[PDB]
Design a protein around this nucleic acid. Structure first.
Ligand SMILES: [Mg+2]
Ligand SMILES: [Mg+2]
Ligand SMILES: [Zn+2]
Lengths: 184, 155, 87, 150, 81, 129
RNA sequence: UCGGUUUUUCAACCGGAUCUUUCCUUCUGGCUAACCUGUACUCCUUGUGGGUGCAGGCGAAC
């Protein structure tokens, strides 16, 4: 059963993903029941330099905790199956624009639906098993901001060679330049 | 303001030249005359349905709203059928390149179509002189309930 | 500075301290020029060829002249890890 | 740099960077919430509860684990007191001072201190009224204050 | 002096500096896994207690409060979390 | 009380420059401050600056080349009325050729020249040269 | 080109429309300018150069 774990189901990549997920149910106790209550809000594949193409797999939001609980093993499995590529579990978040001084008051905008917050959330999602420590924001003499994200000395082996890919994904999403760092 | 009774003083209080023919019996029994003030303002349902009188009401009376339309916070309700409106503004002193905080109280007339407490912000329209100091008539009360919905803290 | 007909006015263009970028004045009897000679193979120190550093009087007066000099050296490679950027 | 003395100190708790739950901590947010509720029932102020959580259990900050601050949680359950905690404490302190004064009259330093306390209380009261935590007419006096305390 | 990297300083220097006055604020305190000499139970005691923390099963008093860092009850053995 | 943050930042920068330092540590950090810094950067009075995230207010590390000889906020943000900009310029700036009066307009934060070009004015902020 | 005047190679500078998870107050209607059209397909260099032309319908043109 493929089209039932998709919210709404067009496209072929999505179908493939669903199939993969279904297949992954044959690991049994660790990867069932928890996998059975999961869905997507579509999948976008992003081109990365080198030849690799990352997989932004968009996800409801109340479902996210479950995904987090499951994630790493599942991700690994996906990678193994869908060779060469990296799989990133990002939550689909709303974003509501700034109430312009002319516009109609559509009841107070929640601060989770502010753009910056959304971006932060996305960032958090992106590096999942690794927590984010410090954030720096380099304002260059040329006139362009480069964000600098610092991560733990732990967990890094989960994240390994994906950093460039992650950066690319971020760029695709927001349009902001990212650099990842590990201080020790 | 009115506050109860309606037919409460020495003279019978009726809308002038409004006739309620006591032969062919009507649905309302007594005919009520009203008008919309215009300028985009709305005549309230309290004015149409009500039993109160007022010559100095902008909806049910004889005064006409024209000229300046001001806004400000209510300071005093105490005197019957009228109000006092505070109207804070900044006076620019040019020598010091800065602003004085200033005052000016506007006494205004309150149609019994409104519930007005001290501290409510009120839109007031200019009309024909009504008393010694009053030139203005309350058109819209903006502070509707305040916190009359959930006054008590217990969820 | 520059005249409309292109050509320069400005009687002399002043030296700026290589450490602060701040201008050295004409009666700055405290400022200094350090000449550090270009070295060759077998040492030998190449004649009439050197790296020059201007230091304003102010820095010298303060005391953090030496440190500045060291820093300057370790960006043209005249010293090898004497001055560290992270202190 | 302090509100009633010449004191200039900077002693304070410094909250860590990560909003996320600490990696070593297991348990559940629900469990934490339950514990908090129990504490409230027993009859403790938010701060005390927080302290307890920090000490006996693995709770760093309640907002870090549950998603909500302790006071909010209390409110949700219907346990947040008639008077906010700090204000109550201040009132209690004032009452003690007053009692002391009643006993011995020549203590001028004590009297001075009392004034300060009163001022502080007034400030707090004003704040609360603005925020509408207290009913917008609530005043602090002497007998009334004592009653409130007790 | 004059020229510094203010962003990433030496670790030792940072350690020396007061909490708060560091580049980013972080606690100097930590949490502890406390083993009571009797029963096999592990309690997570914060290093700067204030309260006289007992084991959840038996009243033994693991830590006594002091000015800063709390003092452990001798028979007890800890491990940093 | 820290009444003005921008002012504090500017003062710190000035202090750093006068003593000859090549970097500052600004401590409260705002949008406005950042904007101000950007203007300076654009005009070349400042090097690369970076914003440390504290998860509270912020903290800016600013690199100074040495060209900036004075910052300075003009504090009670006076409402400058297009024809009035000139007077301000005459007052604050050391010459008629260079230097910038930074003023917050509804079109954004910019130097006075930019404002003139755009034909906008608003409240004054500070000045740089 | 008959001391002035038109474009390109180019610039910085000031705008406008958009598309980017983006509404810019919303409709009850008037004119739907226009083709998103395609109803006969061709006045016609071998063509998608070009327009007599009206049922579904983009409305910002008021
Ligand atoms: Mg202080
Ligand atoms: Mg004081
Ligand atoms: Zn034991």
């Amino acid at each position: 059963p493929q089209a039932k774990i998709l919210s709404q189901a067009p496209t072929e990549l999505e179908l493939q993903v669903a199939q993969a997920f279904i297949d992954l149910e044959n690991n049994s106790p660790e990867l069932k029941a928890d996998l059975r209550a999961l869905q997507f809000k579509s999948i976008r594949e992003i081109e990365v330099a080198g030849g690799k193409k990352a997989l932004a797999v968009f996800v409801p939001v109340p479902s996210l905790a479950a995904y987090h609980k499951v994630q790493i093993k599942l991700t690994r499995e996906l990678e193994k199956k869908f060779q060469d590529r990296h799989v990133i579990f990002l939550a689909e978040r709303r974003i509501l624009p700034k109430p312009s001084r002319k516009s109609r008051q559509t009841q107070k905008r929640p601060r989770s639906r502010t753009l910056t917050a959304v971006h932060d959330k996305i960032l958090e999602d992106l590096v999942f098993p690794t927590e984010i420590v410090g954030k720096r924001v380099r304002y260059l003499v040329g006139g362009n901001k480069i964000q600098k994200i610092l991560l733990n000395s732990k967990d890094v082996q989960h994240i390994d060679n994906k950093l460039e890919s992650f950066q690319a994904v971020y760029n695709k999403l927001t349009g902001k330049q990212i650099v990842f760092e590990i201080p020790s | 303001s009115t506050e109860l009774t309606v037919q409460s003083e020495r003279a019978f209080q009726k809308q002038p030249h409004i006739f309620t023919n006591p032969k062919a019996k009507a649905n309302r029994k007594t005919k009520r005359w009203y008008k919309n003030v215009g300028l985009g303002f709305k005549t309230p349902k309290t004015a149409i349905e009500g039993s109160y009188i007022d010559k100095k009401c902008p909806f049910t009376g004889l005064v006409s709203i024209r000229g300046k339309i001001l806004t400000g916070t209510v300071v005093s309700t105490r005197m019957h059928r009228t109000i006092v409106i505070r109207r804070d503004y900044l006076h620019y002193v040019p020598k010091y390149n800065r602003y004085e905080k200033r005052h000016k109280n506007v006494p205004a007339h309150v149609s019994p179509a409104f519930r007005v407490q001290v501290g409510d912000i009120v839109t007031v329209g200019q009309c024909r002189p009504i008393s010694k100091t009053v030139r203005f008539n309350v058109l819209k009360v903006a502070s509707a309930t305040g916190k009359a919905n959930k006054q008590f803290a217990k969820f | 500075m520059e005249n409309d007909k292109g050509q320069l006015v400005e009687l002399y263009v002043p030296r700026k301290c290589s450490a602060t970028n701040r201008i050295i004045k004409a009666k700055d009897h405290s400022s200094v020029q350090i000449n550090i000679a270009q070295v060759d193979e077998e040492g030998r120190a190449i004649p009439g060829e050197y790296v020059t550093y201007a230091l304003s009087g102010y820095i010298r007066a303060r005391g953090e002249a030496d440190d500045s000099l060291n820093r300057l050296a370790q960006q043209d490679g005249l010293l090898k890890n004497v001055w560290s950027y992270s202190r | 740099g302090r509100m009633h003395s010449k004191g200039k100190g900077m002693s304070s708790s410094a909250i860590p960077y990560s909003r996320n739950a600490p990696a070593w901590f297991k348990g559940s947010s629900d469990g934490v919430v339950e514990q908090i509720i129990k504490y409230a029932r027993k009859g403790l102020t938010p701060s005390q509860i927080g302290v307890l959580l920090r000490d006996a259990h693995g709770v760093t900050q309640a907002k870090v684990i549950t998603g909500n601050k302790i006071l909010r949680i209390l409110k949700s359950n219907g346990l947040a007191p008639e008077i906010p905690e700090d204000l109550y404490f201040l009132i209690k302190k004032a009452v003690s001072v007053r009692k002391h004064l009643e006993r011995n009259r020549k203590d001028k330093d004590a009297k001075f201190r009392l004034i300060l306390i009163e001022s502080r209380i007034h400030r707090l009261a004003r704040y609360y009224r603005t925020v509408s935590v207290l009913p917008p007419n609530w005043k602090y006096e002497s007998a009334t204050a004592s009653a409130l305390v007790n | 002096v004059l020229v510094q990297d203010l962003l990433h300083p030496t670790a030792a220097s940072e350690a020396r500096k007061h909490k708060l006055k560091t580049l980013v604020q972080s606690p100097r305190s930590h949490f502890l896994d406390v083993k009571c000499p009797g029963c096999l139970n592990i309690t997570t005691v914060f290093s700067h207690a204030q309260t006289a923390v007992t084991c959840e099963s038996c009243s033994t008093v693991l830590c006594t409060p002091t000015g800063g860092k709390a003092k452990l009850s001798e028979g007890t053995s800890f491990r940093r979390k | 009380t820290r009444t003005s943050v921008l002012a504090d930042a500017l003062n710190a920068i000035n202090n750093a420059e006068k003593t000859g330092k090549r970097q500052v540590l600004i401590r409260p950090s705002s949008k406005v401050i950042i904007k101000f810094l950007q203007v300076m950067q654009k005009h070349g009075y400042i090097g690369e600056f970076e914003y440390i995230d504290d998860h509270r207010s912020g903290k800016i590390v600013v690199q100074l080349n040495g060209r900036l000889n004075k910052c300075g906020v003009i504090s009670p943000r006076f409402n400058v009325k297009i024809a009035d900009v000139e007077k301000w310029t005459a007052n604050l700036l050391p010459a008629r050729q260079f230097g910038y009066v930074i003023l917050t307009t509804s079109a954004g934060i910019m130097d006075h020249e930019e404002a003139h070009r755009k034909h906008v004015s608003g409240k004054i902020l500070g000045f740089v040269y």
